[PDB]
Amino acid sequence: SPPLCTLPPGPEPPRFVCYCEGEGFNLYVTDAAELWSTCFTPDSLAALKARFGLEDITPRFRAACEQQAVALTLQEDRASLTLSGGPSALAFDLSKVPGPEAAPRLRALTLGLAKRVWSLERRLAAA
Amino acid sequence: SPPLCTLPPGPEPPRFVCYCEGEESGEGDRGGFNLYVTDAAELWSTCFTPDSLAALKARFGLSAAEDITPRFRAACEQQAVALTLQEDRASLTLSGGPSALAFDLSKVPGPEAAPRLRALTLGLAKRVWSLERRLAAAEET
């Protein structure tokens, strides 16, 4: 079940969602209008893991999402995502995704979320 | 929690979300009822006025103080929502209940639609996160 969290974590309205896909594996951040991505290649992902000392990034990100231990700085076309909890905080550089590439992802994101909600409410009612 | 469903039903990737708004409980701000349909590119709405909602309710024999949200909710749970899309217009048919209810929807203008779609996306993600937390609890622990 694909991990995600929203920011800010307060009772205030959510402004950003952080999620990941498919260990083409990447981290994403969106305010539902623009999309930022780690834009990994198979090579630069391996480079990244080795620098931090790795297995898989997803479980750490999942754990951060549950603890709401995700920090986000955003400037211009630049964002960073920080995961806290592990033996070392992990920071990721993200870049803005051009509109034409971002649009189908944002579209599928919205439709998939809606389908999850419907499914989770279905399952939660049977509990 | 606010009702919704996705279409088409079953295992195939969702193409549309249907949801509703208004008829809020309590003595606080209460908005008029509307049904929404989106493919996450465009937004369609019933765009009800007080008169057009009354006329719709008459067309299918409902009273004025009657909330329509619970009929929508039943339709969503059973996935008895049928959608037709013309170029400009849409229809939504709810068959959760004993009598079918048909709704005319029209396109919401971009400057109103775009902030509604963003809030929808962000709100759903908050829900998902909240639901999976409540689920992990109930099912095992």
Q: For chain A, what are the domain ranges?
A: 1-127
Q: Taking Cα atoms as reference points, which of B122, A88, A89 lies closest to residue A80?
A: A89
Q: Taking Cα atoms as reference points, which of B35, B60, B14, B9 lies closest to residue A113?
A: B14
For strand B34-38 and strand B43-45, is the pairing parallel, antiparallel, or unpaired? antiparallel
**DSSP letter at B80?**
-
CB atoms within 10 A of CB A51: 8
**DSSP letter at B60?**
T
Contacts of B132 in chain A (CB under 8 A): 1, 120
Contact between A24 and A38 (Cβ < 8 Å): no
Q: Taking Cα atoms as reference points, which of A118, A109, A126, A115 lies closest to residue A20?
A: A109
Compute CA A111 distance to the chain's CA centroid, rounded to the nearest angstrom.
17
Tokens (6 digits) for B27: 């003595």
Cis before A8? omega within 30? yes
**DSSP letter at A2?**
-
Could B124 and A118 be called an inter-chain contact, meaning their C-beta atoms sit closer than 8 Å? no
Tokens (6 digits) for B86: 């013309």
List, edge to edge, every strand of the sheet that includes A90-96: A4-7, A16-21, A26-30, A35-37, A90-96, A78-83, A70-75
Q: Which residue has the tokens 């979300």?
A: B17
Tokens (6 digits) for B98: 């004993």
Tokens (6 digits) for A90: 């992990």
Q: Taking Cα atoms as reference points, which of B18, B10, B13 lies closest to residue B75?
A: B18
What's the CA angle centered on B135, arms B20 and B122, to 5 degrees?
A: 40
Resolution in A: 2.3
What is the C-alpha separation between A15 and B123, in angstroms, rounded? 9
Q: Which residue has the tokens 């974590």?
A: A9
Q: Taking Cα atoms as reference points, which of A125, A110, A87, A95 lies closest to residue B124?
A: A110
Structural method: X-ray
Tokens (6 digits) for A116: 């999850």
62-101 in B: which are within 8 Å (CB) of A?
A: 76-77
Quickly list DSSP for A31-49. -SSSEEE----HHHHHHHH
Could B125 and A6 be called an inter-chain contact, meaning their C-beta atoms sit closer than 8 Å? yes
Q: Is A95 helix (H, G, I), strand (E, B) or coil?
A: strand
Q: Which residue has the tokens 């594996």?
A: A25
CB of A5 within 8 Å of a chain B CB? The answer is yes
Q: Taking Cα atoms as reference points, which of B5, B7, B62, B9 lies closest to residue B33?
A: B62
Tokens (6 digits) for A8: 């800010």
CB of A6 within 8 Å of a chain B CB? The answer is yes
What is the C-alpha separation between A94 and A27, in angstroms, rounded? 8
A-B Cβ pairs (cutoff 8 Å, strict): 100
What is the C-alpha separation between B13 and B76, in angstroms, rounded? 17
Q: Which residue of B19, B132, B139 is the best one to mutate when testing the A interface, meaning the one whose CB has the most A CBs within 10 A?
A: B132
**Alpha helices (H) along chain B:** 50-59, 69-78, 110-139
Tokens (6 digits) for A82: 């920080």
What is the C-alpha separation between A74 and A94, in angstroms, rounded? 9
* Cβ-count burial A96-119 (b if 16+ within 10 Å, e if not): bbeeeebeeebbebbbbbbbbbbe
For strand B4-7 and strand B16-21, is the pairing parallel, antiparallel, or unpaired? antiparallel
Could A110 and B1 be called an inter-chain contact, meaning their C-beta atoms sit closer than 8 Å? no
What is the C-alpha separation between B63 and B131, in angstroms, rounded? 34
Amino acid at B31: G
What's the CA angle centered on B97, arms B94 and B102, to 5 degrees?
A: 25
CB of B9 within 8 Å of a chain A CB? The answer is no
CB of B8 within 8 Å of a chain A CB? The answer is no
State phi, psi for A113 to the nearest 5 degrees. -55, -45
How far is it between the farthest Cα atoms of chain A? 45
Q: Is A93 helix (H, G, I), strand (E, B) or coil?
A: strand
Measured in angstroms, the CA of A11 and the nearest CA of chain B are apart by 10
